Amino acid sequence: QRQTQTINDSWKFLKGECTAAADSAFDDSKWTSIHLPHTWNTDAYTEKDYYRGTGWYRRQLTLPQGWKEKQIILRLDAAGKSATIYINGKNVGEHAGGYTACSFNITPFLSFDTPNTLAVCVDNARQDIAPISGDFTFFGGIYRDVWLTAVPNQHFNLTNHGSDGLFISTPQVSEEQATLSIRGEVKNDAPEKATLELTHTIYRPDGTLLQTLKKNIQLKAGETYAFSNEATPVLKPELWTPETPRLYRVETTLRNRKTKTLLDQSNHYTAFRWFRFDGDEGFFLNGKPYKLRGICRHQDQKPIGPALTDEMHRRDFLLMKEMGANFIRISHYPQDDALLEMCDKLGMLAWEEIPIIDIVPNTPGYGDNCERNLREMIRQHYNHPSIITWGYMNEILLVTQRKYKTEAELKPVLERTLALANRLERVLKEEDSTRISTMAFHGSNSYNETGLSKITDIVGWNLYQGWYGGDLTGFEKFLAQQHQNHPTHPMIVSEYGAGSDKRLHSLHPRAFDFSIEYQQKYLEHYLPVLEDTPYICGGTHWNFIDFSSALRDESMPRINNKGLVYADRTPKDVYHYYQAAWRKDIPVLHIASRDWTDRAGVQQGNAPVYLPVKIYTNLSEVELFIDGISLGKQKTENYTATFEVPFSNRNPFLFAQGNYQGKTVQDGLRINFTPIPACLDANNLKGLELAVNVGSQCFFTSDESQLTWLPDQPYAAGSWGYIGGKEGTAQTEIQNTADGPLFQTLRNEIEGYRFDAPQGVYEIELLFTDIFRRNRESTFGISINGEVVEESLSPCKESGYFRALRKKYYITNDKEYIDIRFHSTSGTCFLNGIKLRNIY
Amino acid sequence: QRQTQTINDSWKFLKGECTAAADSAFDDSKWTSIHLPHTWNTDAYTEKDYYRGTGWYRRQLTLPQGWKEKQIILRLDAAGKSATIYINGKNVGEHAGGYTACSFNITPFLSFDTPNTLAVCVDNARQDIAPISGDFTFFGGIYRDVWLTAVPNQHFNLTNHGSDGLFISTPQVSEEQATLSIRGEVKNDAPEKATLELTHTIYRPDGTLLQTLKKNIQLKAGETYAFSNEATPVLKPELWTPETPRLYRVETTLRNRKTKTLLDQSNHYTAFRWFRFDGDEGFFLNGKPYKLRGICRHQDQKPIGPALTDEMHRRDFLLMKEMGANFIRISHYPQDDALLEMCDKLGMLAWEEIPIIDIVPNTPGYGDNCERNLREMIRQHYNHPSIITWGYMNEILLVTQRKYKTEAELKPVLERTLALANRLERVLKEEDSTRISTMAFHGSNSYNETGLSKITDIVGWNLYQGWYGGDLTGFEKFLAQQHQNHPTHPMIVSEYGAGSDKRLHSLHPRAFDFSIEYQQKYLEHYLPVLEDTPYICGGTHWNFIDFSSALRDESMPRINNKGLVYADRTPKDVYHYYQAAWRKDIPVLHIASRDWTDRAGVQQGNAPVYLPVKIYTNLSEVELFIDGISLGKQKTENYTATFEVPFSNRNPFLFAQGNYQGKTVQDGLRINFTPIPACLDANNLKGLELAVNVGSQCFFTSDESQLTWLPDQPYAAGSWGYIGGKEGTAQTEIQNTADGPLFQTLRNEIEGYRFDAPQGVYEIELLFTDIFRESTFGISINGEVVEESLSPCKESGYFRALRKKYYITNDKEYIDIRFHSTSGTCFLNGIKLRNIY
Numbered sequence A: 001q002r003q004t005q006t007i008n009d010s011w012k013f014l015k016g017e018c019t020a021a022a023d024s025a026f027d028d029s030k031w032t033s034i035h036l037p038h039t040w041n042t043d044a045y046t047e048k049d050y051y052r053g054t055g056w057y058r059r060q061l062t063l064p065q066g067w068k069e070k071q072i073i074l075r076l077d078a079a080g081k082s083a084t085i086y087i088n089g090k091n092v093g094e095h096a097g098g099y100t101a102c103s104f105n106i107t108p109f110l111s112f113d114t115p116n117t118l119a120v121c122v123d124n125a126r127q128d129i130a131p132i133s134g135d136f137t138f139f140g141g142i143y144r145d146v147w148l149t150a151v152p153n154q155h156f157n158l159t160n161h162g163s164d165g166l167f168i169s170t171p172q173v174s175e176e177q178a179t180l181s182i183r184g185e186v187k188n189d190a191p192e193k194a195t196l197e198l199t200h201t202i203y204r205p206d207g208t209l210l211q212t213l214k215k216n217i218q219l220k221a222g223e224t225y226a227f228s229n230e231a232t233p234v235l236k237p238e239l240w241t242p243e244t245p246r247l248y249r250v251e252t253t254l255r256n257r258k259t260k261t262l263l264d265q266s267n268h269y270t271a272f273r274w275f276r277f278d279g280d281e282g283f284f285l286n287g288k289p290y291k292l293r294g295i296c297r298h299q300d301q302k303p304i305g306p307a308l309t310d311e312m313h314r315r316d317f318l319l320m321k322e323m324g325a326n327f328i329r330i331s332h333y334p335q336d337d338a339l340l341e342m343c344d345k346l347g348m349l350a351w352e353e354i355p356i357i358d359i360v361p362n363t364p365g366y367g368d369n370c371e372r373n374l375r376e377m378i379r380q381h382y383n384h385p386s387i388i389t390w391g392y393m394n395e396i397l398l399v400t401q402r403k404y405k406t407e408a409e410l411k412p413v414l415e416r417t418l419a420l421a422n423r424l425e426r427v428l429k430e431e432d433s434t435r436i437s438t439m440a441f442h443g444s445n446s447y448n449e450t451g452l453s454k455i456t457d458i459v460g461w462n463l464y465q466g467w468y469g470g471d472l473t474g475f476e477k478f479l480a481q482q483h484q485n486h487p488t489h490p491m492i493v494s495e496y497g498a499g500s501d502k503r504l505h506s507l508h509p510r511a512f513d514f515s516i517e518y519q520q521k522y523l524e525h526y527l528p529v530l531e532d533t534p535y536i537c538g539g540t541h542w543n544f545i546d547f548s549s550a551l552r553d554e555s556m557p558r559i560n561n562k563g564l565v566y567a568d569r570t571p572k573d574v575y576h577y578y579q580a581a582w583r584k585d586i587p588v589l590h591i592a593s594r595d596w597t598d599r600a601g602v603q604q605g606n607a608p609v610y611l612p613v614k615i616y617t618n619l620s621e622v623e624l625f626i627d628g629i630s631l632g633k634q635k636t637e638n639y640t641a642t643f644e645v646p647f648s649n650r651n652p653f654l655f656a657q658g659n660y661q662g663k664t665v666q667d668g669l670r671i672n673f674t675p676i677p678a679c680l681d682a683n684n685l686k687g688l689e690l691a692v693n694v695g696s697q698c699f700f701t702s703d704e705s706q707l708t709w710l711p712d713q714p715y716a717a718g719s720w721g722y723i724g725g726k727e728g729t730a731q732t733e734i735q736n737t738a739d740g741p742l743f744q745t746l747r748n749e750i751e752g753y754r755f756d757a758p759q760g761v762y763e764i765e766l767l768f769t770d771i772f773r774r775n776r777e778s779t780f781g782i783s784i785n786g787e788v789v790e791e792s793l794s795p796c797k798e799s800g801y802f803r804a805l806r807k808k809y810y811i812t813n814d815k816e817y818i819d820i821r822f823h824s825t826s827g828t829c830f831l832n833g834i835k836l837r838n839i840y
Numbered sequence B: 001q002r003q004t005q006t007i008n009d010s011w012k013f014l015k016g017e018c019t020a021a022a023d024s025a026f027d028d029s030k031w032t033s034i035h036l037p038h039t040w041n042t043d044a045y046t047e048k049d050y051y052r053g054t055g056w057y058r059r060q061l062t063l064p065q066g067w068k069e070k071q072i073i074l075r076l077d078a079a080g081k082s083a084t085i086y087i088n089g090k091n092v093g094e095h096a097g098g099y100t101a102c103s104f105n106i107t108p109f110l111s112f113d114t115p116n117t118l119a120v121c122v123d124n125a126r127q128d129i130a131p132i133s134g135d136f137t138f139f140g141g142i143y144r145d146v147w148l149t150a151v152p153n154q155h156f157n158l159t160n161h162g163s164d165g166l167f168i169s170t171p172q173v174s175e176e177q178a179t180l181s182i183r184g185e186v187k188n189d190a191p192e193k194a195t196l197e198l199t200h201t202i203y204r205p206d207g208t209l210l211q212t213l214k215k216n217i218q219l220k221a222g223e224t225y226a227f228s229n230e231a232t233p234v235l236k237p238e239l240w241t242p243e244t245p246r247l248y249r250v251e252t253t254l255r256n257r258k259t260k261t262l263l264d265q266s267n268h269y270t271a272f273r274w275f276r277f278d279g280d281e282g283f284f285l286n287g288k289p290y291k292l293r294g295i296c297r298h299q300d301q302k303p304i305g306p307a308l309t310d311e312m313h314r315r316d317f318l319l320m321k322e323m324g325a326n327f328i329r330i331s332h333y334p335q336d337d338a339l340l341e342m343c344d345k346l347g348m349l350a351w352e353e354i355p356i357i358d359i360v361p362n363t364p365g366y367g368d369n370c371e372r373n374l375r376e377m378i379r380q381h382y383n384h385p386s387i388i389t390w391g392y393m394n395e396i397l398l399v400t401q402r403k404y405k406t407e408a409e410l411k412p413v414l415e416r417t418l419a420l421a422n423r424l425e426r427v428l429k430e431e432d433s434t435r436i437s438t439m440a441f442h443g444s445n446s447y448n449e450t451g452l453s454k455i456t457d458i459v460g461w462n463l464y465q466g467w468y469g470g471d472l473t474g475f476e477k478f479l480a481q482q483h484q485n486h487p488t489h490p491m492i493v494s495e496y497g498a499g500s501d502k503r504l505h506s507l508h509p510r511a512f513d514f515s516i517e518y519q520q521k522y523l524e525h526y527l528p529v530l531e532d533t534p535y536i537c538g539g540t541h542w543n544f545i546d547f548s549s550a551l552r553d554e555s556m557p558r559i560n561n562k563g564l565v566y567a568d569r570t571p572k573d574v575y576h577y578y579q580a581a582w583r584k585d586i587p588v589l590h591i592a593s594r595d596w597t598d599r600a601g602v603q604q605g606n607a608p609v610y611l612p613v614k615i616y617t618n619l620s621e622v623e624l625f626i627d628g629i630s631l632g633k634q635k636t637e638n639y640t641a642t643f644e645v646p647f648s649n650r651n652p653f654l655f656a657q658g659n660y661q662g663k664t665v666q667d668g669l670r671i672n673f674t675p676i677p678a679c680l681d682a683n684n685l686k687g688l689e690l691a692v693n694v695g696s697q698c699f700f701t702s703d704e705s706q707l708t709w710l711p712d713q714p715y716a717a718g719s720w721g722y723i724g725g726k727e728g729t730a731q732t733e734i735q736n737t738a739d740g741p742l743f744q745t746l747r748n749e750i751e752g753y754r755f756d757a758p759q760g761v762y763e764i765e766l767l768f769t770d771i772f773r774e775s776t777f778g779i780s781i782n783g784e785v786v787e788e789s790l791s792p793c794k795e796s797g798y799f800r801a802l803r804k805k806y807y808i809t810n811d812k813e814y815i816d817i818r819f820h821s822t823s824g825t826c827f828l829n830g831i832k833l834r835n836i837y
């Protein structure tokens, strides 16, 4: 029979080049011991310049004696970006492509009397393999399962593009009936003739046997026999949807015709459904209107990168499934078998694509390698009924149009780009006639003007109005313009989203403060547009997770923080705005404050400090309590309500209540509240650490110190705050702090900062980062109540640009105010943070 | 006058030795930019062999023109383990000790016409500097503040063992009156004499002037001058406790005698309190009985090491204070000024000690460096009224008794130890006659036999009965035997605790399973003993935090996990047990399930699955609800109550309430629950991932995958479980897994593992790790051989994780895995089953 098991254990690993690494007699005792899956690019979660090059893997294979007469097939589900395989020093074969599987019949290279050496040379530097550009990390290593499969000399073909070698499709599907087509190849690796029996057994969703198909086949020595068997038409087929994922098991068995001995067996699911995309009326599933409620999912997890175990892929899926999504855009690369299994079985429509992104280079072999990767993806995943569309390109004009601004520079690149698109479109439709082709665009009409949008069956727009410029309403405007000018191109919003940082909150959220609240304002705008516009087939949110992009700075360097869930897969609050809107079958009532559990605020006297607490829910009406006090009931709109909550106590308990389908629904949590006095005196200074996010309207809570830094405020008589200057903001990474966001904002041209406070000894901490690398170069003095504390401070000369300075001073105040004045010398005065404590 | 500011910023740094690193014109462009505080030992949070050696720090000094005629004093509050200071290439000084400060008048080497180069060479390799052994990482680098203080040529001495040069004490303190003594040194670095007015201003707690001393003094060029000025006795003085931290500010000022212009100035707090330790009745503060409710606290935080900013120090102090502690054992080394500031001002009694641990080696120069470190600690922190006791040794016999067995071998080592001990003891009492001396013992009467327990004023026992062997009840038995045999040695339990791991839970918690629940068990037993035994002066819990100890393996390698709060300072549920028992001023009601938010259990049919939910509270009666259904009222004992809670829904809401001094009190949280079926069939297998922590009574929940692995259960008809074997357990780290504990337990001599299950195709994952440092065995499934001869230790080695997956076709009504040993034993560390087709 067939024995399939992993060989993920007991590997030795070496980063870099190594002469002789494939020899069986090599001494790899000093190499690193590892267990697949594996990447050598954990460094990308800190370092922007992560290592791209060569890495070697070694494993001993001591084969079972019971396998002496079988064919041994080696399968690498993934190696990024390329792999060359060695058995006992001999080059067995290679593979180009970091997200498709490859497979090899290694039987002629193996020995059953002595042990064998399997060595793999992996490379993530090759410029002739996609992607060569794109907003994610190109991790190197063997980060998916590796298998050995042992079969008898007659077995299904396992070396057709690293696939299962079988291909099952439904040529016709209606409510009344459907046809079923069962195809594949049998391979005869014996030196003589073989007379076999092929059997297809087809089961209903409930497990009962529907039909058995039997053919005799004769194979000459060494022959590959293609079979194509049609089943009896299936009457009143049970139709598949993400809500009702009815599967029909197809068991395909190979038997010795004489002896009836079982040789090989391969199992697959098929399912019966049909779909359609309409430019006016959107998407239809089994003849009914169906809004695609989608998410995109990258495949890494900080800090192990793409080296996920399969229960991790399943965990990601359950989260997406429990949120209400019925559609996943698997991007920008094809992903784990374990993922697609859940899409079929638990129910989720799928788009899947290869990563041809940003720009079509002029690299020999690139086109050819793209073609092979498209075939490998379609053939490896042909049997997943959840998949309805293949794609091969994403924003293929984005870098082209940035780099080249002349007609002469552009013409060749566009020509090369349209030729490869048309090339791949032909390959797609010849690989698979049962599915729709798609392509994803960045937000520009150049895709219509260049002809790129005239190629695939449907089109996707990556739209970010209200995040990367423009206003939120430019999103529906853009879609309306496209539908007017190209009404026959059915439309998916293949990317939309906005960045967010658990550390940052704002009562006045604005784009690129990275506050939790701004991403919610953005998503709260976009989802109803997606739900209620008929010519929008659906959208796929970007992205389900905060994911690795080594090249990103912004509020969380190395991470693209547009997730609905943090990197470690804890959900953000806004996850439950999706759930509330997309799950009708359960009550959803979520106090939107897990993202904001450490609050602080400026208190007048002993009066409460008010701060919004938002709720996400599908209940019509909710009541909010704090420490047992009701704040009233509110009517929900767009799945949300916001209460102005009076905080006083240090550890308040928040509690929410409503009715859903005649039952009581409840939620609650404790958070922390810290009051900071607006007017300082001897009493209220004891224990006070007054910290201010100068130049920002965001509260910043360090996930390292747990200290919250308050939004800046202007100086007022009896209080404290700034004097002069204007807000400034950088996105560049800030050296030498864990609290980047605090230093990315400053008050530029500041004139002073003042606290009215009693007489005593105070510790003053100032925070500096020069964000104007443009610079002349800022240098300035600083005094406090007229006592110079810096004669000529220049952060960029002493430390450089975009680097933290935190300087503490002890000062004796003999006034009733602490007046910090800035005194220009060159460039501008600025201040990114201030923090005050009373010492004596 | 005096300006103090930091130079923590704008450093370059290079790991290792370097030719010509102190040269003013050395090229450090390609060095790593860093900002103090800093450590080069972040590696210690993953690598056991952390880098111990040399590191180089360079920063430019551009002196303000206003300092031209001032004295510049450099201060390094801490550098581990030793540091040497260059200014413009010239050796200025060096210091030995990684937890005390050092200072140098650097004026002679500085220019004011050109930038100055500051270079510091640091070394955490040196074996002649305490500690040379002990249960924590010897972090290297400059991990506390660095200061420049500029003063006039007539200034208080700032180069007396890196202290402030002033020393304030109260010779007599009673309810009616107290005496106050103010001492210090004035130095005169001018090239000729000078005439000064020295003034002490003393302020009440409410900020009012109580008294002004003034004394005239003259100093010849380059002379230092010692003063000691008694003060008018203070009448009906405001006493200080953790609860009432009444402090008197003392301002000391230096004015030129003719021009009366102010020169230098230094502020310090004093306070009025007395105390004593009674071998029979415990501890007394201001004449009243007082239970010492202490915790110990290491100073690092994963993964930044001890490179903490001062708000992190203050954050730590607040959690300890909000938990209700009144005592803190600052160990095993003196800690940050920022922390001590809070013990004075917000109120916590303090024990502070230097890290002389495990064994007094024969290492040239070790003794001398120890004595200097003791002098330093005491001089540097002399003015902190929170401190009532100094110490210098912890468990100084522990490694000595492992390494040397015979009387002949022990002789010299014991001689060195008693000598070093008595020597430091006498240095302590020279340095400070106002505080109590202490030492900390491990749990052996040999500290008595060898005479070590006669030396200090009080003794500390680090006791671990119920964790490192023995029984929970051995704790009180050990202490009652000491009291019987040494009634005049007043006792503090200076350490006690149990490891815990958020990933691990058990309905039957046992020591060294590292379950949340066992730590709670251990502590719930110890704390009443501490509270209710009067000859126990108090205790200090070990430890307040999970902290770095690179040499440790066990469930969380590199980490000692006996904290009350995780390394990131999130509290464990048990933290609120202490808070229930030590805070009577407020209501405490805490559902003890923040450590257990991801639950799973074997479900019979569709009946609910019972799992305990514990509650910590100072109320006498609590009610627990799940998803709105009440589970009754329960009377609390020992600040806690447990409910058998019926789980069913996937995302249940837990809710508790009761009454405290009139008011209604509430708490709630959501958690996640995943039922696993006891009897598998075609329906319940859809989406099922049956994962079993084979060999263990703990649920293990990966913090990497979030999957929960169930307690092993024996096979029963109609269900699933193991067949044969016994539990086996290792504490050695496991390579190549983030889920160590999963692999550190196993079923040894296992015969089979069986699932009753429908026909179909199944994915079976087997987890192996050989912990027995050669086992070899075949594995069959339903009569088909799936491994002819598997030997984990030959394929992978010992203590290395093996995860193997197989696709299996079951044409029977069960899945029968069998183990056939041909050598060594058969073992299996975990299994996980999915149905595929």
Ligand SMILES: O=C(O)[C@H]1OC(=O)[C@H](O)[C@@H](O)[C@@H]1O
Binding pocket: A134, A135, A136, A394, A395, A442, A462, A495, A542, A560, A562
């Ligand atoms: O900027 C972003 O968030 C993303 O936006 C896009 O349009 C890209 O297709 C995607 O790869 C980037 O990650």
Ligand SMILES: O=C(O)[C@H]1OC(=O)[C@H](O)[C@@H](O)[C@@H]1O
Binding pocket: B134, B135, B394, B395, B442, B462, B495, B542, B560, B562
């Ligand atoms: O092993 C432990 O947990 C502790 O035991 C002790 O008694 C040691 O003094 C301490 O440094 C250790 O950390």
Ligand SMILES: [Ca+2]
Binding pocket: A077, A144, A145, A310, A336, A337, A338
């Ligand atoms: Ca996989």
Ligand SMILES: [Ca+2]
Binding pocket: B077, B144, B145, B310, B336, B337, B338
């Ligand atoms: Ca400090």
Ligand code: NA
Binding pocket: A693, A694, A695, A696, A741, A742, A743, A744, A745, A746, A832, A833
């Ligand atoms: Na700021």
Ligand code: NA
Binding pocket: B692, B693, B694, B695, B696, B741, B742, B743, B744, B745, B746, B829, B830
């Ligand atoms: Na186990």
